[PDB]
Amino acid sequence: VLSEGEWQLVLHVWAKVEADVAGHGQDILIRLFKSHPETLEKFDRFKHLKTEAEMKASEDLKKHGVTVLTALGAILKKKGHHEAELKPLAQSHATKHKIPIKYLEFISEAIIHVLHSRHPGDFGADAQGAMNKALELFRKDIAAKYKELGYQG
């Protein structure tokens, strides 16, 4: 678990993301899709995309990015008390979307990359560590629901 001081560093860095949710969301998805191409194949909605230029021009992609980051931001602000908001996402991703837990690890690495590139010399190592912990908490809990259903993969 995180300490109050660590949760503060997490929510403080999330304030930068909320200033431009659509922007940070577009950068995250593209970094994920370009770095791990297998993840894009999981989206029937976006699989027609082939180049970064095409991904950059898609308004629908940004629309879903905002949907995703909005849901994530709501979870982080619960400071660990996310049981209710994590259940439906675990059910939908494990059984309907067929998303491996490993992909959750990928998306977590994409967030740290975006924050550093977009905020040069403004994303501290202390904050990076706090964000790491919050994301690992989220993952551990997700995997617990996945295992229950019979997935966890």
Cα 112 to the chain's mean position, in Å?
10
Q: Does 35 bind ligand HEM (CB under 6 A)?
A: no
84-87: long-range contacts at Cβ-Cβ below 8 A with a sequence spacing of 24 or more? 86/138, 86/141, 86/142, 86/145, 87/145
Cβ–Cβ < 8 Å for 12, 130: no
Nearest CB to ligand HEM, comparing residues 72 and 114: 72
Interaction between residue 116 and ligand HEM (CB under 6 A) = no
For 97, residues 6+ apart whose C-beta sits below 8 A from its C-beta are: 42
Annotate each residue in 67-106 with x if it binds ligand HEM (CB under 6 A) or - if it does not, as one string: xx--xx----------------x--xx---x-x---xx--
Question: Contact positions toward ligand HEM, by CB under 6 A?
Answer: 39, 42-43, 45, 67-68, 71-72, 89, 92-93, 97, 99, 103-104, 107
Q: Which residues are annotated as a binding site for O2?
A: 64
